[PDB]
Amino acid sequence: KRVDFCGKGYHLMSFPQSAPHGVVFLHVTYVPAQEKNFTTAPAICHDGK
Amino acid sequence: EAEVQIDRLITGRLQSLQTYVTQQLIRAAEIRASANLAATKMSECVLGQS
Numbered sequence: 001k002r003v004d005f006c007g008k009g010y011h012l013m014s015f016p017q018s019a020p021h022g023v024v025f026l027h028v029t030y031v032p033a034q035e036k037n038f039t040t041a042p043a044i045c046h047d048g049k
Numbered sequence: 050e051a052e053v054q055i056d057r058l059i060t061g062r063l064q065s066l067q068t069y070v071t072q073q074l075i076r077a078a079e080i081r082a083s084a085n086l087a088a089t090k091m092s093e094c095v096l097g098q099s
């Protein structure tokens with residue numbers, strides 16, 4: 001859950017690969033797309049509640 | 050006779066310059082870790098909730 005620790009976006013999973021004197025991580029993340037506009041409210045009022 | 054006296058200065062000044070350059074490497078390795086912590090705090094406290 002650490003932001004940016006395992007790639008950009010919401011981390012899903014990672015896979016390691018070996019390199020000559022190092023390691024390559026393949027990070028799979030979720031990136032939200034195609035946002036729409038809406039009107040919001042904090043609470044609803046119904047029956048005086 | 051001035052070669053022998055110039056070499057005594059050359060040796061000293063080289064020693065002093067190289068001491069300066071070692072202590073800067075050791076001080077930069079410490080500034081680097083602080084900046085690496087600042088970069089993690091910017092990710093985890095400013096662009097998120099930790």
Ligand SMILES: *[C@@H]1O[C@H](CO)[C@@H](O[C@@H]2O[C@H](CO)[C@@H](O)[C@H](O)[C@H]2NC(C)=O)[C@H](O)[C@H]1NC(C)=O
Pocket residue numbers: 035036037
């Ligand atoms: C949600 O609505 C806002 C405001 O209506 C949109 O903001 C527009 O942004 C563009 C930038 O290219 C401005 O030129 C417009 O003046 C803004 N207002 C408009 C178009 O009414 C925003 O784009 C909307 N978001 C989505 C995802 O559609």
